[PDB]
Amino acid sequence: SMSYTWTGALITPCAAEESKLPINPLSNSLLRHHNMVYATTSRSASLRQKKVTFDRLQVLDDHYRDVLKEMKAKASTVKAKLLSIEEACKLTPPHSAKSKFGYGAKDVRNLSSRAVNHIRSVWEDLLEDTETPIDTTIMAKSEVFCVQRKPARLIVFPDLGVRVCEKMALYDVVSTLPQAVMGSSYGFQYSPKQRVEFLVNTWKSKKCPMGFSYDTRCFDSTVTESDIRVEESIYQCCDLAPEARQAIRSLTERLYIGGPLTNSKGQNCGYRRCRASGVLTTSCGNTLTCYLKATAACRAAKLQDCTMLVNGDDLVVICESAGTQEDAAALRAFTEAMTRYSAPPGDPPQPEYDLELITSCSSNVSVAHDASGKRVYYLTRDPTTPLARAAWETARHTPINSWLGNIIMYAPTLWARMILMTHFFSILLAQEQLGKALDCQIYGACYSIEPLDLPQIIERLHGLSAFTLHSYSPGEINRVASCLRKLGVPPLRTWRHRARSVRAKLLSQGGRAAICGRYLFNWAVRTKLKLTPIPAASQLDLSGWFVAGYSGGDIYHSLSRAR
Ligand SMILES: CS(=O)(=O)NC(=O)c1c(-c2ccc[nH]c2=O)c2c3c(ccc2n1Cc1cc(F)ccc1F)CCO3
C-alpha cells in the first residue's frame, strides 16, 4: 500500500515562518556566514511529500518469524503499569501543542478541570471505540541546517488529549520493554560514555572486526501496517491492566497503523498508512522494527557474530569478518534481505575495518588524552549542524536549546568546550542568566537545566577526564578547523581569548560560577586548578536520562512542582 495519499490541500503553517538566519551582533560573534544558515519551512513541504510517498512491497520469511518469536519470549517477562491522569499530565512539556478542545499544556500540567475532564473522555473513548480513525495534524518541521537545501521534515501528531492517553497506556511499556527485548543492543540505555564503551568493547571483542552503519531511506514511510501490528503483538506480551490492553489495541487500529491528515487550517490533507513521527511509540516501535528486520537480515546474509546497536531507525552492526570479498557479498545479501523486509537503503552500506571511520547516531569514536597522557575514547560529530543551530538560538528565543544538549552530550569534544561553552557562558554571564533553567532535549525527552549545574552533570556523564582532554586526533582538529572556515566562525585562538576572559569573570563571582570557571575552562590556562570530584555530582538524580528514547513522543522528564 501507499505510505501516503494526498487530497491536494496544502501543508500549511500556523504562523509566519522564518527561513534566514537574522543578522544579529551576538550570533555574528559566533558565525559570520549567516547566508549559509537556513531554517526549513512549509515552503519546501511538497518536495518532502514527493520523497516520502511510495508503495511498499513487503515479503516476510522464516528468519523474520524466528526473530519475532525470540523477541516476544523476552517481551513476555515484562509487567507494565497504567499511569494515572495526574502522572501522565506531569510528563507533558510546558510548551506542548495546545489542544483544539479549549486548553493548553499549562492547563494539563496544572491538572485543570477542563484538561482533566477532556483527557478522561478521550480515555473512555479509546476503551469503547476500537475503529474510528483518530485525527492527526500534519506540519512541516522548522529545523536549522548549513547549506550543502534540505526540504522540511513532516511531523504527524494527534491532539494533546490523545497524547496524554498514550502516556497512561504506553509510557511504562515504551520505557521498559525495549531493553527487556533487545538487551545490550538497545542504544538508548547508554550515556555517551557507556555508548563509546560498548562500541569499543564490541569492536575489540572480535578476532577481525568488520562494522557498518545501515541507512534506511525515509524509515517512517517504510514501516507498514503489518510492522505496526507486529509491534503491537510484542506490546501484547506484557502483563497489562485490562484498560491498558484495550487502549493499546484501539490506539494501534485508530492511530498507529494510519489515519487522516489535517493541515493547520483544518483542511483534509490526506491519508497515512505508515509510522506517524509524533506519537509516543515512534521511538520504541522504530527501534523494535529496525532491530527485528536487521537481526533477521544478518541470518539471511550469513553475517558472522552480528552485534547490533539500534536507536530508532539508526543502525550500526559490528561483526566477525569472513574476509573482504566475503564481507562485501554478505553485506549486499544483508541489504537485499532488508529491502525485502521494506527497509531499502538510502546510503549504500559499506564494510568498515576501522571503528573511528563508522558514523552511527551521527557520531564517531575519537581518541584524546587525559592529564596523565592516558588515551580516552569519546564520541564526537561534525560540528556544522550544532554551530548553525547555536547561532540561530543566539539570534532568536527558541523553546528547545540544542546548544545546551550539545554541551551535555558532547562535553569532551574540542568544539563544545572551546566554542559552545565559551560563547554561551560569555552571553549568559553578561545577561545575569547563568542560573536561569533552560529546556534542552536528551534522547528526545525534554529537561529543564541551569547552565551553572553543567560541571556536576558533565562529571557524572563523562567523568573528570572531560575537563582534562588534550592532544585531540589530527582528523578531529582538521574537521573542526575546516568547519569554522566554512561557517566563518572565528579561529580557536579567538575562542581561547574569549574563554580566558569569561573564566576570570566566573572565578570572580564565587559560588557555582567559580566552579564553572574552574572545571569548564581549565583548558584555557597554563596555571591549572585542581579538579576534584564535585560533591553535587554523586547526589544528582539522573534517573530517566538514559533509559529509553522519546523523540516525537511529547515527553518532559524534569520534576513537577507541588500544588
Ligand atoms: C535523535 S534522539 O532525539 O533520539 N537523541 C539524540 O539526539 C541523541 C544524542 C543527542 C545529542 C545532543 C543532544 N541531545 C541528544 O540526545 C546523542 C549523542 C550521542 C549518541 C547518540 C545520541 N542520540 C541518539 C541519536 C542521534 C542521532 F543523531 C540520530 C538518531 C539517534 F537516535 C553521543 C552524544 O550525543
Swiss-Prot record:
Annotated membrane topology: Single-pass type IV membrane protein
Stated name of the protein: RNA-directed RNA polymerase
Superkingdom per UniProt: Viruses
Effect of residue 361 to R: In strain: Isolate pCV-J4L2S
PTM characteristics: The N-terminus is phosphorylated by host PRK2/PKN2.
Signal peptide: none
Catalytic activity field: RNA(n) + a ribonucleoside 5'-triphosphate = RNA(n+1) + diphosphate
Function: RNA-dependent RNA polymerase that performs primer-template recognition and RNA synthesis during viral replication. Initiates RNA transcription/replication at a flavin adenine dinucleotide (FAD), resulting in a 5'- FAD cap on viral RNAs. In this way, recognition of viral 5' RNA by host pattern recognition receptors can be bypassed, thereby evading activation of antiviral pathways.
Modes of activity regulation: Activity is up-regulated by PRK2/PKN2-mediated phosphorylation.
Cofactor(s) for this UniProt protein: Mg(2+)
Cell location: Host cytoplasm; Host endoplasmic reticulum membrane
Location of the RdRp catalytic domain: 209-327
Binding site for Mg(2+) 2: 215, 313-314
Residues with the Phosphoserine modification: 29, 42
Cofactor: record remark: Binds 2 magnesium ion that constitute a dinuclear catalytic metal center.
Subunit field text: Homooligomer. Interacts with non-structural protein 5A. Interacts with host VAPB. Interacts with host PRK2/PKN2. Interacts with host HNRNPA1 and SEPT6; these interactions facilitate viral replication. Part of the replication complex composed of NS2, NS3, NS4A, NS4B, NS5A and the RNA-directed RNA polymerase.
